Symmetry: D3
Subunit: 274 residues, 6 copies
């Protein structure tokens, strides 16, 4: 009868983050996976500026954790007030640093999976879009782009990048009409990877995370940056080439280069591959 | 039977002369109806048609009390009772595409029948497409007659259905239904024929109920993805507007 | 049970020495069939396979009377009767040159996935213009990251221009096995066909393509390419426009 | 002293009512001259000026016997004898539509900067295909940020495709005044000419352009555009390729 | 006879940065301008990892300083050891977080002017490339892309972005041959905005900073992001659109939007501009 | 007088049959010399020339002991004593452009004379260009004869000299000297005629003295700016290579 996606036995707190008020941060007991969650279900997990600061902190920390390979981004719930479920309802209307959180997710050399456990609206919908993968609660996920309703707009990863997932016609519809969609509808459109039973949402996220983590970390990083490079232009190039430079630094040819400086370099042993 | 509800529309003053195109303003809504008016010839456009279409769309672009354009074809044919949105060629249609592309408002294509050749490319370039379950027919006959739309007609179609489906549509030039195109991603929704314009109006109303400013920015944001420097010009152009509305811009 | 109609195909002259690949021309149609001929190792390719694939494809590209290439895999495996289009590089970078060959040739290339399409064989399918797949036996699986390798070009990024960024990332990040119907619903497979009729449907598709203005078909292909291939795409497309401007004056 | 040779130009029929702009056709050449006619306010444009500029340019675009537009400013100022091509918007967004008109028309547009080119007038010069400038009197100055405005499109970003990112950023971020020779050395001005011969040189350039295959010239312009104009650039270029494919079969 | 570009009277330290060892950080006594400088002239101002951390900190701080409009990035000198001058000689060979410093400079909504007071080599040359503007010492600036000499490479803002300044032929030459160029040569090629007398390098930087700071801050920010968008693809779009969203939030039309939410919105008063 | 120093070069084994092209390996350096060999006709290429040029460049691409390609024209003409790099058209040259573009080594064009039409476009697509102060002549005659290179010949030229200069070069088709092209940004350096190949060799040696791996990555990094998804394929392709050389790639 318990419906909560959260398995209390599978997560441990992360040292140094006891002061978090708007966000919860866990590490899996076994897996190289973390759980990052909005913690204001009482207001449909809207973020206020302090929420965004905490979210940046946490994701930055996870990015820099060598033993963490996958990030699960979700929202806690339900609301104690009305039992309503929310991933994130966007900006607390009662902010623009959220764009920095977008780039943090876009640029981190690890797969970020959004788990949409309820309402994903406005800024909250856009966070889901920018994530690498999305899994959504069959019963409770609700996607609604309310930006134009309130005279706001996400003209970047929220809208344009949505079009690289569902195509130009559907992305336009989602934003121009701001209708409410289910998990299954978004899956059919191409913005949701798979639909899961509410109670199994995080269980499935964990299975996906494990299938990801079982692969070459190196290849996974190159892959993400390769997907990014399609659309991220010169920044995408910087990141992908950045990873390629890291690879180069490991070859004997690069060791000879640095040895010489510390002669003349000898490139004789190294072929002109083609 | 007919999608067109004559009670809902009023002719636009100043266009009593149109022969290939009809032009209506909704009686209550900030919505216009622009329609091919040569059902007798499958709503194929001749040069005069294009002039009129440009003229009317341009007029609608410049009407500050009009948020949405429904673009469709009148019917049925008096000759054979068939349905056609637009069957293609009988100033240039390329200029009509850009006008639709660049205008700071949502253009919804209502495919009420055959949409072939240039008529199909018109549907592709519109922001949204709604299609008749019974009578919408999507057919790219370009390669069949040794012609091609190498711009919004084809490449932009790939930004809606993906590279595999878009190549199929053009290379084979098969005919597709509303529901097939909906599944592939070129059609937003399928509607019963008689309700096609009723649904269009409902979509237009939901669009018109939003901040017009955010809607304009969003459109150009979607265009900017693919329109390169032109897209930048249009989006930045709006941003400059927002700027002039600022106390900082005033002091300068 | 087998997709290949032996009566329908004739060997191409000048290719009697092929060992890893088969190359047929249709008895009536302007269509050729190029296939991996190593069912024994699930049609995995070795350097010699690539060499042959490239020769064959190049020859097909230059043949003025051929309009469509059908790219597939022979089978079943004599060892276990298992079907495979191509399982990628032999675990026992010329392939990238074959991708470009397929990408750049002024002719439609249709991949017929008759079985396992894994790793580089999956990437081969992605780069093709159209894909038709066997309902019963086509299995799509991107195993790159499993072996610590990756295709950072047409294998991955271009797939995203077919199924979208969410699905493309899933296909690679998880490396799961998908059927013909799943891929068809995602946008990377044009149509699912019954195993036995896969090449038959392939020929019907080739015939509809071959029936249209061939000049139009070339311009359209490069127009679709131009969207993603930047300056190289511009070169190929302008190139054909130049060809058009050499018939008048 | 004045760049305009009155003997060389004839008024265009249907434009007797022009007040902010002058529109001439060359007596012999397939070249027209379009000019700001408000030397009194340093050729600053008001909404009515834009309307006229667009009409004139549109008419020129549609004229089958005109191959080159020369865009310039009349002068000197009757008030102080100061020269100005165009000083931008009248401090006392149709202009963006004029940019696109210049950008998209299948004809070469040459800007002749005979004096001050500031703000939007500077941006007009940037968007033109070629620029020739007066050694003595051309002054290039991007004043946008001074007045809290900006051109975020062809005025700024496109300038970077002429002078590079460092120089383009400098021109806008500092808003300094540059001469013809400086701009020529930076890459935004094609050639510097003596004030008096500016239009003469303009006509010589137009004549060399007008002398080549006009179909080639159109394809080349859109090819250059295609580099930066994305899908819109693809449309225009493909469009002309389509035109080429309508002369054979 | 004193040749040092540094005017000791014109700069004040920045509170909270007394612990800096590898980097110096000053605020101008009058102007909304800061001075950020490499402080290891003894090793030609090569950065080690701790150097990059400090540089990120400082630039991040300057980005977030509302009263600071322009950043002057340079190197201190001369070397006490041999009197040699250096802006920055790149990676301390005796790191890859420098890519994050690149993005910080690329993305900050303020003009960063590099003042090349000596050697700019490897990673140090690339930092200069990514800056919005470059001013260079006539006597002492030396530009040398040594990356390929040591088997390394900057495949992003260091190389490709250089091509958007000097063109494809010159950028290729600079990297493939790794020759040494003067201020004047780089100016002619298009990567240096102006050449200044060594002693007047920072004086000129200050004049440029003042001409920049006298303009609309708003327009300057939009302009930078507009220049970026040419090449930065979707990330560039995110940033430019991000600034446009900030503008929108200021209009009456956006106030009505948020007012409503806090039902129906009324858009009657707001025109459909075109 | 002549740029060519016969003492410095040895014919390449296997190409004793070439008639339109000469092909040399330097006697010490990892550098080859590829040259048009029809000075009698201004080094214009006919179809057979293109086949040979492709063949030789392809061979050089595949030679792991060759770092740099010097591409030039032999002369002077025996008929009139003039100089020509390549004057354009007399498998396809477009395929030669891509081979030059995609090969994982630096191709330096030595313009020793007239470089016109397709010959000019060849110089544009090479990584670096050195030109004879006295005799290099750059002329885009494309529009003059109703032809155009709408790819690397023109668009890519704009990524070297900027949009204004590139448009001038093509629209007017004027003739430029080495020094003019150097100032505009299409020519890396100008050399005295007799020293042209000597300087080429010095540039090649400086290139060859660097990590071949970093050089390949850098080239594709420069290409990736403009070559879109093709550029991505080539750059990623190299990165995959670096990957396979890894202990992680081995364990997999
Ligand atoms: C996400 C939306 C569409 C879901 O609406 P729903 O009807 O299910 O719940 P609400 O009653 O609208 O919201 C629950 C409580 O949280 C407040 N709240 C919700 N979102 C925000 C926000 N982005 N910024 C500030 N506050 C928010 C509501 O006010 C409510 O509080 P109470 O006044 O009932 O105690 C909808 O939530 C939305 O779009 N916003
Ligand atoms: C396409 C994939 C998933 C096929 O897997 P499947 O389980 O169906 O067949 P296997 O039993 O794993 O292997 C079949 C035989 O073919 C060889 N082989 C398969 N793929 C490759 C490859 N990419 N490179 C080199 N060889 C491959 C195997 O050696 C196997 O032979 P046996 O060891 O069973 O005799 C993968
Ligand atoms: C192009 C710029 C820099 C010209 O500056 P300059 O110092 O040479 O002439 P001014 O004395 O500043 O002004 C000339 C007359 O023209 C009007 N004017 C100039 N530019 C504009 C503009 N962009 N919008 C509206 N009017 C403009 C001035 O009003 C001035 O008239 P007087 O006030 O002197 O009678 C700038
Ligand atoms: C920038 C380069 C080309 C300038 O070389 P220069 O001959 O003028 O000075 P050096 O003697 O090479 O260098 C001065 C001291 O600093 C060390 N050093 C310089 N750059 C680095 C670096 N990137 N990483 C680590 N150390 C560096 C030198 O070793 C020298 O120390 P001493 O051993 O003489 O005490 C040249 O500096 C370069 O490219 N690197």
């Amino acid at each position: 009868l318990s419906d909560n996606p959260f398995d209390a036995k599978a997560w441990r707190l992360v040292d140094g983050f006891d002061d978090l008020t708007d966000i919860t941060y866990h590490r899996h007991v076994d897996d190289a996976t973390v759980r990052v969650a909005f913690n204001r279900p009482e207001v449909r997990n809207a973020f206020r500026p302090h929420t965004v600061d905490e979210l940046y902190r946490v994701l930055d920390h996870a990015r820099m954790s060598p033993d963490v390979g996958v990030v699960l981004l979700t929202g806690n719930g339900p609301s104690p007030k009305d039992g309503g479920w929310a991933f994130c309802s966007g900006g607390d209307q009662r902010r623009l640093h959220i764009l920095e959180v977008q780039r943090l997710i876009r640029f981190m050399p690890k797969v970020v999976i959004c788990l949409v456990n309820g309402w994903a609206a406005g800024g909250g919908h856009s966070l889901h879009v920018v994530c690498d993968l999305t899994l959504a609660s069959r019963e409770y996920a609700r996607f609604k782009q309310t930006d134009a309703d309130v005279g706001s707009f996400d003209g970047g990863y929220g809208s344009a990048y949505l079009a690289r997932q569902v195509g130009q016609k559907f992305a336009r519809e989602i934003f121009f009409l701001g209708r409410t969609y289910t998990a299954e509808q978004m899956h059919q459109m191409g913005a949701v990877n798979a639909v899961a039973e509410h109670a199994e949402l995080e269980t499935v996220g964990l299975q996906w995370a494990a299938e990801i983590n079982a692969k070459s970390p190196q290849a996974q990083r190159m892959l993400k940056f390769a997907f990014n490079l399609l659309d991220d232009g010169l920044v995408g190039q910087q990141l992908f080439a950045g990873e390629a430079t890291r690879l180069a630094y490991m070859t004997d040819e690069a060791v000879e280069g640095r040895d010489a400086f510390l002669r003349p370099p000898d490139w004789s042993p190294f072929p002109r591959y083609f």
